[PDB]
Amino acid sequence: TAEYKAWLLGLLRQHGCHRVLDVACGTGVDSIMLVEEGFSVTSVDASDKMLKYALKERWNRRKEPAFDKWVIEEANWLTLDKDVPAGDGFDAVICLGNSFAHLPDSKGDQSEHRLALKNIASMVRPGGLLVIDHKNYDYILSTGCAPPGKNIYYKSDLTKDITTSVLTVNNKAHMVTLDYTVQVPGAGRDGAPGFSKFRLSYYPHCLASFTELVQEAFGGRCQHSVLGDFKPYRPGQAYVPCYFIHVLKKTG
Amino acid sequence: TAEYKAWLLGLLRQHGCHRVLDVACGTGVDSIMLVEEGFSVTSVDASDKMLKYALKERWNRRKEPAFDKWVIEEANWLTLDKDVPAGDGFDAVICLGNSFAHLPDSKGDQSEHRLALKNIASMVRPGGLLVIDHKNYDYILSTGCAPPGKNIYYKSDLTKDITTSVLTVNNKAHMVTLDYTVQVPGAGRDGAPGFSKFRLSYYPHCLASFTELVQEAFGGRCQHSVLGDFKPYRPGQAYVPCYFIHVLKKTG
Amino acid sequence: TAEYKAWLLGLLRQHGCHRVLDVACGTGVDSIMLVEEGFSVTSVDASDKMLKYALKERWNRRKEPAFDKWVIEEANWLTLDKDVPAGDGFDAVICLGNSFAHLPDSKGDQSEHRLALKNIASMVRPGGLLVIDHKNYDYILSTGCAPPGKNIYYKSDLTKDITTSVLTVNNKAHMVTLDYTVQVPGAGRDGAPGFSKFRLSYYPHCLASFTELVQEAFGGRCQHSVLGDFKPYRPGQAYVPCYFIHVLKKTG
Amino acid sequence: TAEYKAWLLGLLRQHGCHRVLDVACGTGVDSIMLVEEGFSVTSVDASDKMLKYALKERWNRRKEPAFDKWVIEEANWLTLDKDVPAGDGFDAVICLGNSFAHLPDSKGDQSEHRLALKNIASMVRPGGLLVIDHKNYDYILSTGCAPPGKNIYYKSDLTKDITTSVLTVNNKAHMVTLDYTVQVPGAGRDGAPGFSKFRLSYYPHCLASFTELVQEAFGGRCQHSVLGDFKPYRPGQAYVPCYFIHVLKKTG
Numbered sequence A, B, C, D: 001t002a003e004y005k006a007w008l009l010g011l012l013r014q015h016g017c018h019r020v021l022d023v024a025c026g027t028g029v030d031s032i033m034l035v036e037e038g039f040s041v042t043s044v045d046a047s048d049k050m051l052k053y054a055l056k057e058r059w060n061r062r063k064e065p066a067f068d069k070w071v072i073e074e075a076n077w078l079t080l081d082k083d084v085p086a087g088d089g090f091d092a093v094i095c096l097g098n099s100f101a102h103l104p105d106s107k108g109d110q111s112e113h114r115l116a117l118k119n120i121a122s123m124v125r126p127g128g129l130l131v132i133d134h135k136n137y138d139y140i141l142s143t144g145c146a147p148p149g150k151n152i153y154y155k156s157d158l159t160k161d162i163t164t165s166v167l168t169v170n171n172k173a174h175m176v177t178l179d180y181t182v183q184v185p186g187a188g189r190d191g192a193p194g195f196s197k198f199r200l201s202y203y204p205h206c207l208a209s210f211t212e213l214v215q216e217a218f219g220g221r222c223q224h225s226v227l228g229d230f231k232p233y234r235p236g237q238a239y240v241p242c243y244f245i246h247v248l249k250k251t252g
């Protein structure tokens, strides 16, 4: 989505951030872009399955200085330091795309989440930033299901029917499982579509908790700001952001 | 809970019931009772592991003319009919112990629960009682946790630790997986005890849904009365029940 | 085999054995028998499923004093001592039907086996008997295949196939998995029978190894002997047995 | 292997092979060599993990024009045809390193075998060459034990034990699973080494079968010849090889 792209860059540039570390390189979608707009991007992910693809584009677009100056290393927020040489601290550390909602709280104690963020944020240098984003589960929870479609991050052209299955654990949301029933265009007889599905689970983080979770990472020395979809967020605000974007100005 | 015993026995007598089909023998607890109580008790359960134990009680007291008659059989509510031929139906069909909750909503809709209940009622000869029962899920779904230890149904002697993990499919409380950890009076070392656990899931049956579900099965001709634990029960009261006992007098 | 029943009863009665412990009750065929013959028998088996099918005949024939004394309890050759108090001892402990072979050597060393044999021999009273047998896994070692329907115990009327997976660890036969492809003559449309299977895995056992392993169970004190099938066996003999039978007269 | 490498190049060379397809690119050891060696390499493996490492080297050496030409890709033999545009056919096609002995016969009939060899063979242009190798399983099988240390391919400086596990189905050698308990020079206390095993499963291919199986995919239209280790191998020859090397001059 144009807006998205716009928002991102404008922020990276509105701070002076040029050196960036992606902690969810995935397919390389956003990193690749950043690599175009002239950024020093070092992207990483823990899943080769995805990384391999990002790595793909590069080799091809290898006949371009921009793409020859791009990194892609595997890593896990659970040891981001051990896997990524922070140096003095990347200008901006970006983790947009509700990537963090993939970290399931295994131990029951949100020990997994603190640690992850701890390492993630650490890589940000003084006067640094962190574009960590998560879906609006506060609502998803209060709704009972997950409203698909409006990907303020991308204008999805494919349609699929979602089936939301939340799982309370001792009264605390422990996970949200989205069951996508994709309706591929043509996969039948006289042209009719085919029905192929896939599902994935995440953690139902709620603004409140994440906000506190995030600061806790920067040891406190930081500037916190949260945008509803892509614009600032004001409690009890007429709107209803699909996404929640938390940006951190590591100050100390 | 001795009390429990008194009330039920009476209802049975006050209504001149003798032949009693127990659609949930479990370990034999109730049947054993009616047994001694002097009732032609034909108890059946769907579990080999459980029945195994009610059977044992029989062999031992096989010497007792009473128990020699008692009859435990395998069977499933989902097919009771074929598995249990009730000549002209029985006098009292009990389903005590929150056993009916175990029946999971596989197909999504409550179709399964239909056949189950549907079949159970059929086991009641016109002018016959039934005592199905379910944990107060209305209140349980608000506390999102299952209070263990006491069950007015009886008083065992096993201290347990529980972990209530509820599930919500598209906002509808689908399942409720309770994880127990029973303390074994002897499993440590120097007298120390053991701690062996297991896990059972149930279907959160709200008083509402069930009363309608149950009567449904009787096609209509019947008398319904739901007592909280075991005393009368009228909506929005001061007392909070842990178990809702549904007593029915099929009349057609 | 009426000839193998005549010998079993002959040997037992011959040595004056009344008390007999079937350490492999199973459905209880072999045990059930001894019972009818006015023999005092306690029957134990490690498998509920099977044991229970015997427990059944007891209730049924419970109307016969004999079965009113017949016993059955779950038990494992590995914890025998604790599951079955031997008291003074049993006159004749039997382990027919290639049951023992079902104990796998998980640990690698016959340790498990020694404990098994050891525990069973501890159920015999000085001047005792033990009828443990084992299929002729010696020839099967040179034929890498086990032919079905050769039981010299009960006429098998269930047509079935079999696939033999002989495992060999470090040149030492370690396992033998027989995948039974039974047929259900009636599982079909116009009478046609259906087809499926169940798995059964046993540890091989060539005469030598077992001939010694077993004596050790009594540790010398014993008059051991092994009939080819049910007749006197002789190494380098003509008739190739198929069921070696070790009879033990604990002497000490 | 000083020897290995030697023979190869020469062979390839003498035949005049330029473009080579490695159907088992693994970590890309032989691919990277031929690359440097000045050969038009197109290598592929069916395993991300493996491949992903060959890819890495290429990215680093990406500078040197050689690796710039290299062509690592994903692909599985079973469908190698619709995975690699045979084009005008390759000059040489290597499948060395006991890689083929990895493809199992889940189907029961070595069908999946004949096909893989077939598709692979299809990547060989007329006057072509095929270098498919495999362990001397004849010996292992006939000896029930797989010898450790004789890796003619590359002198292994490792100290791990080997537990050869041959599996049998209906009298046919279905699988050979070796357990290599490799010893980490340093994993103990006082500078001691540690221990960690790892078992792998290969299909016990015997020369007779293989030799047959190979020319088939060819259709008798070739010139087959198998080396002992790297020298002429004749039946009965006192020397017991370890790696049979089949070379095919697909002459058709």
Ligand SMILES: Nc1ncnc2c1ncn2[C@@H]1O[C@H](CSCC[C@H](N)C(=O)O)[C@@H](O)[C@H]1O
Pocket (backbone or CB within 6 Å): A023, A024, A025, A026, A027, A029, A030, A045, A046, A047, A048, A050, A051, A075, A076, A077, A078, A096, A097, A098, A099, A102, A103
């Ligand atoms: N513990 C963790 N640390 C770092 N990366 C992780 C991770 N857990 C999951 N990931 C990876 O992050 C990726 C999912 S993020 C999905 C959104 C995607 N990046 C987008 O732009 O639309 C996967 O490749 C997953 O392997």
Ligand SMILES: Nc1ncnc2c1ncn2[C@@H]1O[C@H](CSCC[C@H](N)C(=O)O)[C@@H](O)[C@H]1O
Pocket (backbone or CB within 6 Å): B023, B024, B025, B026, B027, B045, B046, B047, B050, B051, B075, B076, B077, B078, B097, B098, B099, B102, B103
């Ligand atoms: N669908 C079904 N049909 C018949 N019996 C069932 C059943 N679902 C559950 N049950 C039975 O419910 C019985 C007792 S209720 C479960 C409680 C358990 N016996 C305890 O001691 O804690 C079990 O024997 C179980 O097999």
Ligand SMILES: Nc1ncnc2c1ncn2[C@@H]1O[C@H](CSCC[C@H](N)C(=O)O)[C@@H](O)[C@H]1O
Pocket (backbone or CB within 6 Å): C023, C024, C025, C026, C027, C028, C029, C030, C045, C046, C047, C048, C050, C051, C075, C076, C077, C078, C096, C097, C098, C099, C102, C103, C153
């Ligand atoms: N560890 C063990 N301890 C006790 N019984 C065992 C055992 N391992 C296997 N068994 C039992 O071996 C039994 C009999 S095997 C076949 C028995 C058959 N009815 C006959 O003709 O004798 C099975 O019931 C199985 O439960």
Ligand SMILES: Nc1ncnc2c1ncn2[C@@H]1O[C@H](CSCC[C@H](N)C(=O)O)[C@@H](O)[C@H]1O
Pocket (backbone or CB within 6 Å): D023, D024, D025, D026, D027, D029, D045, D046, D047, D050, D051, D075, D076, D077, D078, D097, D098, D099, D102, D103, D153
């Ligand atoms: N079905 C198949 N298709 C393609 N490649 C295969 C294959 N089965 C296994 N392989 C691959 O071959 C490699 C193992 S064989 C390489 C072993 C070599 N001797 C060494 O020690 O270096 C792995 O990449 C595996 O993924």
